[PDB]
Amino acid sequence: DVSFRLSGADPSSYGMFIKDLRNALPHTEKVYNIPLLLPSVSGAGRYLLMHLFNYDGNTITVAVDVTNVYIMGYLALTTSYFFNEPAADLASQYVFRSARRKITLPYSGNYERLQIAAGKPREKIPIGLPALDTAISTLLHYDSTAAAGALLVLIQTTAEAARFKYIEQQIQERAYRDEVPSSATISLENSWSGLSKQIQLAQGNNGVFRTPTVLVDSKGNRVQITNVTSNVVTSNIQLLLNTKNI
Numbered sequence: 001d002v003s004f005r006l007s008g009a010d011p012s013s014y015g016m017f018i019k020d021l022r023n024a025l026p027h028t029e030k031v032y033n034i035p036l037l038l039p040s041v042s043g044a045g046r047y048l049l050m051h052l053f054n055y056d057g058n059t060i061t062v063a064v065d066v067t068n069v070y071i072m073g074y075l076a077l078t079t080s081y082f083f084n085e086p087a088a089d090l091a092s093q094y095v096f097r098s099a100r101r102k103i104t105l106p107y108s109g110n111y112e113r114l115q116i117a118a119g120k121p122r123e124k125i126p127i128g129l130p131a132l133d134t135a136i137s138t139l140l141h142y143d144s145t146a147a148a149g150a151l152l153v154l155i156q157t158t159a160e161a162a163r164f165k166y167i168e169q170q171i172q173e174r175a176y177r178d179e180v181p182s183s184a185t186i187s188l189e190n191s192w193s194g195l196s197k198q199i200q201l202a203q204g205n206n207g208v209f210r211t212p213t214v215l216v217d218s219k220g221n222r223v224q225i226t227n228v229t230s231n232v233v234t235s236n237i238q239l240l241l242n243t244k245n246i
């Protein structure tokens with residue numbers, strides 16, 4: 001398990017949490033020196049538990065699939081909550097069995113569906129450590145509409161920060177003031193699977209991508225990533241989705 005406490009949190013302690021998150025995901029290979037996540041994992045070892053504590057010391061426990069860093073569900077007090085998707089129903093066979101009831105949320109976990117449920121795109125939702133503290137608090141008491149927005153915050157501040165150093169830095173910039181994500185942030189999120197694929201295809205292609213990846217950069221301009229000499233590859237992405245899962 002890994003843990004993060006918002007009480008007394010600062011950029012450093014958040015850094016230590018994102019480091020622990022990355023370190024808790026198993027891999028046997030690196031590709032261009034980036035951890036390659038496993039194709040699969042059977043049983044309860046598929047899932048990592050993150051204990052998150054809000055400023056007042058109340059906690060939720062979040063279950064994460066270690067093969068793709070997807071949030072499956074969470075436990076808050078004696079109630080479990082899982083996305084409405086087959087992967088989360090499967091996870092419910094292994095985690096939080098001890099819950100007194102199990103609620104299935106009325107959406108799946110994908111960005112599109114969560115934004116519909118929340119009533120807004122994540123271009124308009126501020127993130128940062130204060131937003132994370134709010135999200136933990138929202139998730140303590142069921143309200144599905146409010147939960148959608150909180151899960152957009154939670155996903156971005158945990159999983160997406162684990163995947164990209166740039167996003168981790170963005171959250172560290174927002175330790176004491178929330179701000180909506182940069183377009184660069186949105187772009188990376190949206191490209192994780194594509195990048196993960198093209199970095200893997202690059203291995204027998206002289207480090208050259210088969211298909212370019214289009215990103216928005218830190219200045220707002222759209223750019224093409226064509227090979228592993230790009231900073232995105234050398235100095236940003238921290239985890240690769242296995243092509244077996246793409």
Ligand SMILES: *[C@@H]1O[C@H](CO)[C@@H](O)[C@H](O)[C@H]1NC(C)=O
Nearest residue numbers: 208225226227228229230231
């Ligand atoms: C590889 O990527 C860099 C940008 O990081 C670019 O300058 C270079 O032209 C690219 N080369 C090929 C062969 O795709």
